[PDB]
Structure formats: C-alpha cells, structure tokens
Amino acid sequence: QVQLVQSGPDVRKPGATVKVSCQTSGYRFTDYEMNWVRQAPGQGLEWIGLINPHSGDTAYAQKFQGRVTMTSDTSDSTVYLELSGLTPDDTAVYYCARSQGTFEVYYFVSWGQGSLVTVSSASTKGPSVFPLAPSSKSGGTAALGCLVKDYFPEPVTVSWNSGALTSGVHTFPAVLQSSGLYSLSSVVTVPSSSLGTQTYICNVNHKPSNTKVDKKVEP
Amino acid sequence: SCERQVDRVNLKPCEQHIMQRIQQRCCDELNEMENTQGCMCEALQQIMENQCDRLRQMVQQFKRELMSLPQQCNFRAPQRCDLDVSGG
Amino acid sequence: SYVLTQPPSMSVAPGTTASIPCGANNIAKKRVHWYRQKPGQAPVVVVSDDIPDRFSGSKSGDTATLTISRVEAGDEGDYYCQVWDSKTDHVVFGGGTKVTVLRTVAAPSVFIFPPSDEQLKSGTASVVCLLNNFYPREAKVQWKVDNALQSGNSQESVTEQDSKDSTYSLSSTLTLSKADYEKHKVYACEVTHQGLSSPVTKSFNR
Numbered sequence: 001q002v003q004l005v006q007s008g009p010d011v012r013k014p015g016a017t018v019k020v021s022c023q024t025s026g027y028r029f030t031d032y033e034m035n036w037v038r039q040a041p042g043q044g045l046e047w048i049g050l051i052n053p054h055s056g057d058t059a060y061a062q063k064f065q066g067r068v069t070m071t072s073d074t075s076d077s078t079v080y081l082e083l084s085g086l087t088p089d090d091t092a093v094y095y096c097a098r099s100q101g102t103f104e105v106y107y108f109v110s111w112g113q114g115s116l117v118t119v120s121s122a123s124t125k126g127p128s129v130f131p132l133a134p135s136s137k138s139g140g141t142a143a144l145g146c147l148v149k150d151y152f153p154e155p156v157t158v159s160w161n162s163g164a165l166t167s168g169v170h171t172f173p174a175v176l177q178s179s180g181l182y183s184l185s186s187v188v189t190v191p192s193s194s195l196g197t198q199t200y201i202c203n204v205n206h207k208p209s210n211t212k213v214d215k216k217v218e219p
Numbered sequence: 220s221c222e223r224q225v226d227r228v229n230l231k232p233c234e235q236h237i238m239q240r241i242q243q244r245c246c247d248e249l250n251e252m253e254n255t256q257g258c259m260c261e262a263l264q265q266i267m268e269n270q271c272d273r274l275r276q277m278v279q280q281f282k283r284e285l286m287s288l289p290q291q292c293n294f295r296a297p298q299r300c301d302l303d304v305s306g307g
Numbered sequence: 308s309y310v311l312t313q314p315p316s317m318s319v320a321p322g323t324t325a326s327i328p329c330g331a332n333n334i335a336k337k338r339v340h341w342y343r344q345k346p347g348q349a350p351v352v353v354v355s356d357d358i359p360d361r362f363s364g365s366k367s368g369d370t371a372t373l374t375i376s377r378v379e380a381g382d383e384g385d386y387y388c389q390v391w392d393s394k395t396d397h398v399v400f401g402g403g404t405k406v407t408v409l410r411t412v413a414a415p416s417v418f419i420f421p422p423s424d425e426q427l428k429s430g431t432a433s434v435v436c437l438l439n440n441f442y443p444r445e446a447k448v449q450w451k452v453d454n455a456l457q458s459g460n461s462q463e464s465v466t467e468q469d470s471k472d473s474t475y476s477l478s479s480t481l482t483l484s485k486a487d488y489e490k491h492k493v494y495a496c497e498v499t500h501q502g503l504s505s506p507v508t509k510s511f512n513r
C-alpha cells in the first residue's frame with residue numbers, strides 16, 4: 001500500500017518561503033524518483049520538479065529554476081519542496097507524485113493528497129457555523145445542511161456524521177463575499193422520517209486558525 | 220561527473236555481450252566509479268552509441284538486453300533514460 | 308518548451324465512445340500517459356505505457372487519443388495527458404479537458420432555509436435556497452423579499468456533475484443585516500429552469 005501523506009495547508013506572506021513535505025510509506029524509499037506537481041485553484045496540472053532520493057539529483061522545470069529547492073531525507077522517507085520568493089500567482093494546491101518507470105516510460109502511480117498553500121498578506125479568519133433547519137412534508141425528500149461563513153483562507157473540509165453520511169451530500173464550492181471572506185454551504189438530502197435517525201452533524205474543520213466545529217441540525 | 224567517469228571505465232567487456240545471448244567482467248568494470256545506480260544511464264547510453272548506433276531488428280534485441288544489464292549486475296535500471304535518439 | 312495541446316472541454320453522450328486528443332510534435336515517438344482527476348481529488352492514472360478496462364490509448368502519429376468505451380455517468384471529470392520529454396528532461400502536462408456526460412432534463416428540487424436563530428443573535432442574517440438535482444447547468448435564481456426583487460445581495464455557486472446522477476446543484480445565499488431581516492418578513496425565492504414549465508417559488512413567513 002503505497003501511501004503519500006503531505007503537510008497541511010499553509011498561509012505565507014508574499015515574498016516569503018514555503019516548505020511542503022511528502023511522507024512516503026509502503027514502498028522501498030530511494031528506489032523510485034518523486035515529482036512535485038502544482039495545480040492552480042481553477043487551472044490544470046503544472047509540473048514543478050524532480051528529486052531522486054538515492055542520488056540526491058534534482059531536476060527542475062525551466063520556469064521554476066532558481067526558486068525551488070528539493071530535499072530528501074532517507075531516515076524518515078520524506079521529500080520536501082521549498083519555493084522561495086512567493087508571488088500571488090503561486091497560491092495553489094501542491095501535489096507530490098511517486099514515479100514508476102524505467103528508461104522511456106515515466107508516469108505517476110501514487111499521487112499525494114495535496115497541500116493548499118495560500119500566499120497572502122491578510123490574516124487568517126475562522127469560520128462561523130449556522131445550521132440550516134429542515135422542513136416537514138412537492139416537498140420531495142428532506143434536504144438540510146450547514147452554513148460556514150466569513151472564513152479565510154480557502155481550505156475547509158465538511159463531512160457529515162463523521163463520514164457516515166456520504167449519500168446526497170453537496171458541499172458547494174466557496175464563493176467570495178463582499179467583505180473579502182470565503183463562505184460555502186454544505187447540504188444533504190435525507191428521508192423525511194428524521195426522527196428514526198439519530199442526529200446530523202456539521203463536522204466542519206478549518207485547518208488554519210485551528211477551527212474545528214461540530215454542529216447539529218434540528219427543526 | 221557522469222561523463223567524466225564514463226571515460227575511465229572500460230565498457231568494452233560489456234559491449235562484448237552482443238550476440239552472446241542473442242560474464243562477471245562487465246559488472247566488475249561497471250561498479251566503478253560512484254555508480255550507485257547513478258550515471259548508469261550514461262553507461263548504458265554509451266554502449267548503444269559504441270555498437271549499432273541509432274535504429275535493423277537486431278539493435279532492438281540489443282536494447283532489451285541492455286535494459287536487463289543492471290539486473291544481472293545487482294543494480295536497478297535507470298528511471299529516466301533515452302537509449303534511442305532519432306536526430307530528425 | 309514542449310507543449311501538449313488538449314481540448315478545453317468535451318461533451319459525450321452516455322453509452323457512446325469518447326476520444327480525447329493530445330497533440331504534440333512527434334508525440335508518437337514519446338510515451339503518453341493519461342490521468343483522470345475528479346474535482347477535489349488527486350489525479351488518478353487511467354492508462355499507462357507498460358485486465359482490460361474501458362480506458363485505452365492508441366498514440367498514433369502527431370496526436371495521441373484516449374478512448375473511453377461505453378461512456379457512463381462515472382466517467383465525468385478532467386483528463387490530462389502527460390509525457391516525459393527527453394530533449395529537455397522535463398515532465399509536461401496537457402491542458403485540462405472537462406468531460407461532461409450528457410443527461411436528460413431534470414427539474415430542480417427547490418428548498419428554502421430560513422436564517423438560524425443562532426445567526427439571528429449576530430448582526431447578519433443569511434437565507435439559503437437549494438437546487439438539489441437539475442440538468443442542464445443553466446439556471447437563474449431571483450430573490451424577492453415581500454414582493455420586490457433583490458439584487459446584489461445574493462451570490463451562488465454550482466457543483467460539478469454528479470458521479471452517479473450526472474446532475475448539478477446550485478445554492479443561492481441571501482446575506483442581509485438584522486435591520487433588513489426584521490423588516491420585510493415575507494421571504495420568497497423563485498427559480499426558472501428548462502425542466503420546469505413555470506417558475507417554482509418557495510417562501511417562509513417567519
């Protein structure tokens with residue numbers, strides 16, 4: 001089971017330096033080269049560079065030459081990405097990919113979870129969770145959800161009943177408010193007989209500012 | 220560098236392996252120097268350059284055996300290696 | 308500077324065959340691998356260059372094409388073609404190709420949510436209207452308080468196509484202060500969609 005685990009989302013000021021980690025397990029380290037790929041919030045995949053833990057050789061893209069530094073630590077089987085001189089265009093989710101191939105074949109088989117680093121001079125603000133109470137009854141099914149508002153930066157994760165409720169869940173993409181703070185709403189459709197089921201919980205998590213809120217929804 | 224140390228190593232015993240399968244001397248020369256699964260791409264590319272440069276249906280058979288050369292010498296095959304250069 | 312060109316988007320009828328081109332200079336000589344990335348997830352390789360599946364690669368001539376046999380609802384997402392350039396020792400990714408599975412028209416399941424009393428303690432009040440499962444994506448939401456149309460106080464976001472239902476969802480939130488919310492206590496949201504003969508409106512009076 002090849003597992004690639006990355007660091008949490010990071011917020012760095014413009015012009016600063018960010019370091020992204022990629023923990024590897026399940027396969028023999030220093031036996032397969034590893035690559036870093038970044039993806040803008042709405043754009044496609046972009047290759048950053050390459051690292052070989054066995055030799056320490058680093059192959060970077062022409063665009064990123066001089067700004068990116070890659071290090072590997074065989075003691076803990078990790079690969080690090082370090083981007084210097086952060087510009088506002090660098091805000092993106094950064095993926096680490098394990099490469100399996102010999103000679104001409106070169107492809108990625110075990111992508112990482114990704115790290116959403118946000119380059120901004122603003123201060124992180126925690127979200128506020130307000131329940132959306134369902135109604136009793138057209139009136140097909142019985143939809144309900146949570147509302148997280150006034151949060152920054154982007155990365156926020158919403159799960160229902162600690163992952164028990166995954167059918168009918170709709171976590172809408174965040175929308176930019178007039179104040180400059182992100183806000184999204186997550187909704188779920190459940191059978192009208194809500195008395196039989198135990199409870200429904202927002203289980204929101206904002207890794208910046210360490211905001212973890214579990215809120216129930218009731219009429 | 221890889222190209223600096225490729226001159227010191229005499230790859231000629233490794234080039235002798237052509238048509239032998241289509242000994243340990245090749246791996247004995249291959250260990251030196253600083254070939255910790257590195258610069259093997261240069262060494263493998265040099266063998267292709269020396270014997271049957273470019274692409275005859277017999278260099279293709281030689282290509283397959285070259286890729287297996289690290290395995291029989293207790294080494295991992297290069298991850299990024301382009302044995303064939305068309306040049307046009 | 309090896310450039311891989313991919314179509315920005317593609318729409319494929321369900322049950323048919325799909326072909327996503329990937330065009331570079333002499334891409335046949337190179338090794339082409341295709342990755343499928345679901346929204347909010349890391350990309351997953353569907354075909355690679357060394358059990359049969361619906362995904363396959365031909366790689367003939369200047370363009371390499373990925374074929375998905377019997378396109379189903381779960382095939383939606385962004386597909387990327389990647390190769391390893393030898394003349395520059397660079398890994399290059401193609402442009403995003405958003406694949407959308409065609410579907411029949413579906414009427415939205417409109418839902419209206421009054422502001423929570425916990426939010427009422429604060430200074431702002433939010434009214435949310437939910438459209439659960441509708442197709443196509445095109446839909447317009449109009450916010451009316453009492454009977455006057457509200458403009459500039461509502462913003463909406465739309466989800467991508469569902470993996471199973473191949474449908475979209477839209478949520479329009481109405482942000483108002485606690486002196487606007489107390490007045491105009493008749494809140495109504497009206498929506499119009501191609502799957503609805505007449506606009507459907509839902510309202511609450513509290």
